[PDB]
Amino acid sequence: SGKRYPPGTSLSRDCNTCICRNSQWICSNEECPGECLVTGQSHFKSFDNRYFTFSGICQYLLARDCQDHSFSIVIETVQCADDRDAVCTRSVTVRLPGLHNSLVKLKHGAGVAMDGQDVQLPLLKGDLRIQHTVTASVRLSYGEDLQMDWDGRGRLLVKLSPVYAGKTCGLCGNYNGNQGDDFLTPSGLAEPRVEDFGNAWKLHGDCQDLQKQHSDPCALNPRMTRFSEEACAVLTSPTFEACHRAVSPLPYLRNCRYDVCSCSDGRECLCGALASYAAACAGRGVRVAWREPGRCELNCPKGQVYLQCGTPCNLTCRSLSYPDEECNEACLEGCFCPPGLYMDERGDCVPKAQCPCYYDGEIFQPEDIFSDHHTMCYCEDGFMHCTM
Amino acid sequence: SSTARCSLFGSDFVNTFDGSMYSFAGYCSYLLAGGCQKRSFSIIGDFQNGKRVSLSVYLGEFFDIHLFVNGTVTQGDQRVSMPYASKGLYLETEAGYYKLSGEAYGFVARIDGSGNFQVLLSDRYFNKTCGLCGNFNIFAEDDFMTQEGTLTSDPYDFANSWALSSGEQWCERASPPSSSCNISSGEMQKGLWEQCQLLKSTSVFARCHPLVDPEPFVALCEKTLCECAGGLECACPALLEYARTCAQEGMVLYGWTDHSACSPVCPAGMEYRQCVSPCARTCQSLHINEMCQERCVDGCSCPEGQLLDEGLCVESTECPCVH
Amino acid sequence: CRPPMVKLVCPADNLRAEGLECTKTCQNYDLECMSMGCVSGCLCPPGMVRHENRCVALERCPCFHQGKEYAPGETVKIGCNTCVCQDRKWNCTDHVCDATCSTIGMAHYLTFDGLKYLFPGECQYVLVQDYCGSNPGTFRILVGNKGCSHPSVKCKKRVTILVEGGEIELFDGEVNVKRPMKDETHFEVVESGRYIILLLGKALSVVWDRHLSISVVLKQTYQEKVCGLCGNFDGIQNNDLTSSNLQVEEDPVDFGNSWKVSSQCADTRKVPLDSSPATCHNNIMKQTMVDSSCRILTSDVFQDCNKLVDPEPYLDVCIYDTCSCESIGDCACFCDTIAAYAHVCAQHGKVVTWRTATLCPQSCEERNLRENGYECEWRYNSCAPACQVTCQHPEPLACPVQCVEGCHAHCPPGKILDELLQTCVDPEDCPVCEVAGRRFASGKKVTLNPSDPEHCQICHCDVVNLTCEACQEPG
Amino acid sequence: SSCRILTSDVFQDCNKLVDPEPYLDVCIYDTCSCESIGDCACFCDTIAAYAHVCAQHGKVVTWRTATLCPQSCEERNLRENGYECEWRYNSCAPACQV
Numbered sequence A: 001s002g003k004r005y006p007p008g009t010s011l012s013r014d015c016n017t018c019i020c021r022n023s024q025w026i027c028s029n030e031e032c033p034g035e036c037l038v039t040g041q042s043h044f045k046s047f048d049n050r051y052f053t054f055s056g057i058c059q060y061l062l063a064r065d066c067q068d069h070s071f072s073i074v075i076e077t078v079q080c081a082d083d084r085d086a087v088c089t090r091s092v093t094v095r096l097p098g099l100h101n102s103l104v105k106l107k108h109g110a111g112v113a114m115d116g117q118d119v120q121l122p123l124l125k126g127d128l129r130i131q132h133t134v135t136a137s138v139r140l141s142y143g144e145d146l147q148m149d150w151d152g153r154g155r156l157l158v159k160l161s162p163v164y165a166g167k168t169c170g171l172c173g174n175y176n177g178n179q180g181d182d183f184l185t186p187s188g189l190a191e192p193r194v195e196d197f198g199n200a201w202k203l204h205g206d207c208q209d210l211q212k213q214h215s216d217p218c219a220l221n222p223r224m225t226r227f228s229e230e231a232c233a234v235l236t237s238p239t240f241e242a243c244h245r246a247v248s249p250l251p252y253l254r255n256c257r258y259d260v261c262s263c264s265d266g267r268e269c270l271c272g273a274l275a276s277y278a279a280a281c282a283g284r285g286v287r288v289a290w291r292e293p294g295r296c297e298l299n300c301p302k303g304q305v306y307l308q309c310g311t312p313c314n315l316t317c318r319s320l321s322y323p324d325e326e327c328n329e330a331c332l333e334g335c336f337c338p339p340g341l342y343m344d345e346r347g348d349c350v351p352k353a354q355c356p357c358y359y360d361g362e363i364f365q366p367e368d369i370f371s372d373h374h375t376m377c378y379c380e381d382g383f384m385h386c387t388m
Numbered sequence B: 001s002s003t004a005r006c007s008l009f010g011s012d013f014v015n016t017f018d019g020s021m022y023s024f025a026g027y028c029s030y031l032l033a034g035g036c037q038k039r040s041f042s043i044i045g046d047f048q049n050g051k052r053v054s055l056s057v058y059l060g061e062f063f064d065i066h067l068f069v070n071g072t073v074t075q076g077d078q079r080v081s082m083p084y085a086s087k088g089l090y091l092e093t094e095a096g097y098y099k100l101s102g103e104a105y106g107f108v109a110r111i112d113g114s115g116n117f118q119v120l121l122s123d124r125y126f127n128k129t130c131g132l133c134g135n136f137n138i139f140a141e142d143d144f145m146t147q148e149g150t151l152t153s154d155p156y157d158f159a160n161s162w163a164l165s166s167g168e169q170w171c172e173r174a175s176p177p178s179s180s181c182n183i184s185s186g187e188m189q190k191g192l193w194e195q196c197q198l199l200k201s202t203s204v205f206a207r208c209h210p211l212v213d214p215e216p217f218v219a220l221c222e223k224t225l226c227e228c229a230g231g232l233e234c235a236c237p238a239l240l241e242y243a244r245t246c247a248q249e250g251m252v253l254y255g256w257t258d259h260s261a262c263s264p265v266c267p268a269g270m271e272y273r274q275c276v277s278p279c280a281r282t283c284q285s286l287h288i289n290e291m292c293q294e295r296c297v298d299g300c301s302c303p304e305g306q307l308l309d310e311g312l313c314v315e316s317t318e319c320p321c322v323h
Numbered sequence C: 001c002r003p004p005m006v007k008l009v010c011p012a013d014n015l016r017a018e019g020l021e022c023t024k025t026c027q028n029y030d031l032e033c034m035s036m037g038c039v040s041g042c043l044c045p046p047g048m049v050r051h052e053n054r055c056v057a058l059e060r061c062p063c064f065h066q067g068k069e070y071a072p073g074e075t076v077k078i079g080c081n082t083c084v085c086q087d088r089k090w091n092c093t094d095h096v097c098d099a100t101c102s103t104i105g106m107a108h109y110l111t112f113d114g115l116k117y118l119f120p121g122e123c124q125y126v127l128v129q130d131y132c133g134s135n136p137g138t139f140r141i142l143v144g145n146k147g148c149s150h151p152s153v154k155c156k157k158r159v160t161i162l163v164e165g166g167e168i169e170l171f172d173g174e175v176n177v178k179r180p181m182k183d184e185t186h187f188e189v190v191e192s193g194r195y196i197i198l199l200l201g202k203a204l205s206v207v208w209d210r211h212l213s214i215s216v217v218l219k220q221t222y223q224e225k226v227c228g229l230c231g232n233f234d235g236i237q238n239n240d241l242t243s244s245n246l247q248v249e250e251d252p253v254d255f256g257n258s259w260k261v262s263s264q265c266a267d268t269r270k271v272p273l274d275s276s277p278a279t280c281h282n283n284i285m286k287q288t289m290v291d292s293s294c295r296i297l298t299s300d301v302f303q304d305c306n307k308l309v310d311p312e313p314y315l316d317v318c319i320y321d322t323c324s325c326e327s328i329g330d331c332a333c334f335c336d337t338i339a340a341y342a343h344v345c346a347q348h349g350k351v352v353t354w355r356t357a358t359l360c361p362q363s364c365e366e367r368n369l370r371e372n373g374y375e376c377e378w379r380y381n382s383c384a385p386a387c388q389v390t391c392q393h394p395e396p397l398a399c400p401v402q403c404v405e406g407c408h409a410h411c412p413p414g415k416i417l418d419e420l421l422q423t424c425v426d427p428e429d430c431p432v433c434e435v436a437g438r439r440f441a442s443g444k445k446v447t448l449n450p451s452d453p454e455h456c457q458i459c460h461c462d463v464v465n466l467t468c469e470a471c472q473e474p475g
Numbered sequence D: 001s002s003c004r005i006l007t008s009d010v011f012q013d014c015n016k017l018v019d020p021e022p023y024l025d026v027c028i029y030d031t032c033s034c035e036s037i038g039d040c041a042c043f044c045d046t047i048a049a050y051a052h053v054c055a056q057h058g059k060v061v062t063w064r065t066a067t068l069c070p071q072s073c074e075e076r077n078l079r080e081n082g083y084e085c086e087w088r089y090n091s092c093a094p095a096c097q098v
């Protein structure tokens, strides 16, 4: 990447390692986890890093375990503004044939509902551990060979471990490290147009087929063009100059322009489109500081403070009740509160003294004493250090 | 035919291309007319608080002109002079009314003294236009197509689906204004009812009826007449529109303003001549007949003498030389 | 309901009732359908699936491709692959066709596996080479441009083909054999139409449009043995940016600099990404005009090809080139970037005619007028069989491109053309010779059978003379 | 440099009669202001004007090569069932004929 490295160094491509010998890099060749991304108005990134756009209105098959049937992820899209080029995802549905053939559904309000009933997170069922996130998201996690991400506003990350390489069919592609064959339909024949490839994956026959996929929605609302341009030029500004060599910013720039000109509220879409590139850069390792008072400083309640690189392991009160549980999680860009303060059930974080206990679901009180005739427990400061 | 005439007259009132009068008091820029599949141009009409403020034309997405009711006309971001002639758009004061013609694109917009708008789209845009003036098909019943492509029945939803926010407009769904008339009616209405009924009773207006039905006009003037603060003129807008549309149908009605007691506003010196020649008689003008024979248009011009000199009537003897 | 049709009722003792909500049409059949109840309307009999308002008795229903229905048994050709669909899916063949580099325009490249990248260099570079890793290798095509970072009326590129130990570099619209090829039977230059097709082997070829359009056609043989500015031709498209030091790169410019031949030359400096490259920058009017002008790639005559080949890469190339390029008398930086797309279309069988008198005229009458009388055998033809039999190549040739564009001489049968005399003349009035009585060549100046001198009755021809020299014995 | 074609080898004879300076200034002005993409006509026309003026003075000029304003004429023959080939470009052939 245009910089010298003394012999013996060991670079990493975030999944493999390279060693500099005799002016040549010897690099390992292991398969790596894949990420299918649904973001913005109608922007897709396949498992093999194929960026495209597809503004269809139906229920589409995003990604299915395609030889054995351990899962299936289906997405549903609706017009998301006044225009005809702003088509965003509303809700996402997951089928778990390995679990009672149950049907989880992440809703538009960032809620979740298994088989009709709503569900209060966390949910540590047999395999899947649905729970909220620092940024009020929803993180589904089936087994350890699958993950997923919230679907409130219409963004979604699916992470598949290399045990699924080459054995998944959907809008996300084969997941075989080859970008070329990602426009593959069920009939096993790549179609060179995104409209046909998208339409080949819709679940309902009454949905309208897409005919033309427009590239410049700015041309139906000229009043926006100029703003969009400058509003997205930040992606090439020195503010993001750090991570231009980790992920190229061209697709995110096109997505930013499309989102700003098309969607109803340009203010929200500009910062929903810059945050996508920031997260993409943060994936590879580069942490970018891009928020400004003008540029969408996220604001959470007055008790909490914005942290760029936090520690989502010990903030919640529940954590103190299960300290043996392990948190192999990196730092997450959100808001937290000082280490003398832990998150309260209501939401206003308090010092660990008045912090309830979550023994078998049921929440106890900071000095509640639950004795018995054979055991005894009392909630001291977030865990009942309790005798038998 | 070969032309159609949208018109945003009165206060909040709109008359679509096919004659679907309604009332809408917006808050941001809207889409008057323009093709909806291929968008070569797009006339945009701006509001501030119910009351309109300007007219705009966005050629493609590279050029834009903002002709403001306050005479001011900016291009892009900078105030320009008048007349203006760039990019194939000719912007000039004709018959005392600011005019913005684009005959290359087949459209002519106009603003009169009081602030009314008037758009004359061409015939090539038949069944092709898509805006706040409804599609230009002969039918007048399906003119409320929202931007989603679905016909509605509430004018405010139709109009709000066409809002065009910008970098510094960011507009929101608009709602009808609360009515204050319902408590204030009575003694004034006794005489007020005649101002609207003369639209169809009066003989000079009585020959338009085979061309245009006058029921919607009297309806709209009647509903806007109540909030008037004791004045006859508060019904003459509709009459004016009734004249203009009747004129656009090919039968111009002459001298309706003799006893209407309401007259259009015009710059001092000039009187509202019904069917004045669009071909003026400025002091510095070459006498080229048979080359200035366009269609007559209603508007106001100087008296019988008093040739024009930069928008100021002066006697023919005092034409100033220029060097 | 309808008498061919039939209704059902939702059982109140289940949840996966799967009624009218989850209708199973053709394309829905393979897909997996998740519902939240049932509608209890009428659904097709459970042996047949609704398709275009019917119920197709046994399913076996059509096979959609490019939005078109194909009755079973029908086959479609994609490249070298025939595809017929049985039940509902196509079981194509597994042939792998010839790959193809390209210098699309003045600064873009299109690798073997298919990948458009931008790299505006000014040094020499290794377009494709076989001396690549463990492989011994043969050929080393290099491409070198001149003043090309701001490509307007400059950047006359020059190729240097170092195959078989013979430099065959080509420049100024004229192939220049610097050193003879050791085994010259492979070498064969076929100047046809507007192109200078070069045949440098049984599985390697070069076609050059005489100005900038350079593209190397490789066959099945190579198949992940090459590397250079055109990637490694393996079918995987992601890894085509592996630099010369075996490290895959994220930026094309770093890749390109790593593939430079002379280390003491000037690296290309990264430029911040901008939609309007050089002159379209602040002149938004010009950018709009350029956009509309390049929109011809999506025009009524290009509709057929747009379904087969994606026009977006070539649209981007057109915009970039004719923004950076300043065209004064030569409107070539615009017409070439469309001729490239037309050439690709023709290679896919979709011949397109797009040149009109007011749009890239392309005269061809200067060849006829040279004769003292106008005999009129030269004429333009959108795309005509390029690699045809003349007096210089009397025998047929396996040849990479189907048809090409340019002044192709049409003239009455039995009067085959010769290249030296621009006229076409009867077969006799050519230096063609039949030494072995067969229609071989212009009496090929080629050594025959040295390693078995028992048959060495060596015989050549110069004009028509059936000449026969000797085989000088070693002892 | 491009407009400098007016003082070139084929135009040497004409310049002895008609001064190319007005036409040179016109060529420079037009080509600078003009934005040429697909039709290099705002240059070929300003040169064809000078060629016409030279021709009317008795100096017929041929300046139009395959890489400079080609101006093909095959479209007036191909429309026929057989390519008749009777039209051709002439730098200056008599205008009002019979």
Ligand SMILES: *[C@@H]1O[C@H](CO)[C@@H](O)[C@H](O)[C@H]1NC(C)=O
Binding pocket: B068, B070, B071, B072
């Ligand atoms: C015209 O209106 C604009 C925008 O409200 C205002 O800035 C300007 O002062 C006005 N000019 C005149 C001459 O009234």
Ligand SMILES: *[C@@H]1O[C@H](CO)[C@@H](O)[C@H](O)[C@H]1NC(C)=O
Binding pocket: B127, B137, B138
């Ligand atoms: C206008 O176009 C619409 C939609 O294609 C069509 O339904 C209608 O018949 C057309 N009307 C006229 C007057 O051509």
Ligand SMILES: *[C@@H]1O[C@H](CO)[C@@H](O)[C@H](O)[C@H]1NC(C)=O
Binding pocket: C091
């Ligand atoms: C491919 O086609 C051949 C020949 O018809 C057939 O024998 C074979 O079963 C097919 N295989 C697949 C995977 O469809």
Ligand SMILES: *[C@@H]1O[C@H](CO)[C@@H](O)[C@H](O)[C@H]1NC(C)=O
Binding pocket: C380, C381, C382, C383, C384, C385
């Ligand atoms: C082009 O040449 C081909 C091959 O000679 C011939 O079949 C065809 O008719 C020609 N087409 C035109 C338009 O001249």
Ligand SMILES: *[C@@H]1O[C@H](CO)[C@@H](O)[C@H](O)[C@H]1NC(C)=O
Binding pocket: D090, D091, D092, D093, D094
């Ligand atoms: C043009 O017409 C003239 C007059 O007949 C003829 O002499 C000439 O050969 C034609 N073409 C040229 C190049 O002079």
Ligand SMILES: [Ca+2]
Binding pocket: A048, A173, A174, A175, A176, A177, A178, A179, A180, A181, A182
């Ligand atoms: Ca793939």
Ligand SMILES: [Ca+2]
Binding pocket: B018, B134, B135, B136, B137, B138, B139, B140, B141, B142, B143
């Ligand atoms: Ca209508």
Ligand SMILES: [Ca+2]
Binding pocket: C113, C231, C232, C233, C234, C235, C236, C237, C238, C239, C240
């Ligand atoms: Ca590769």
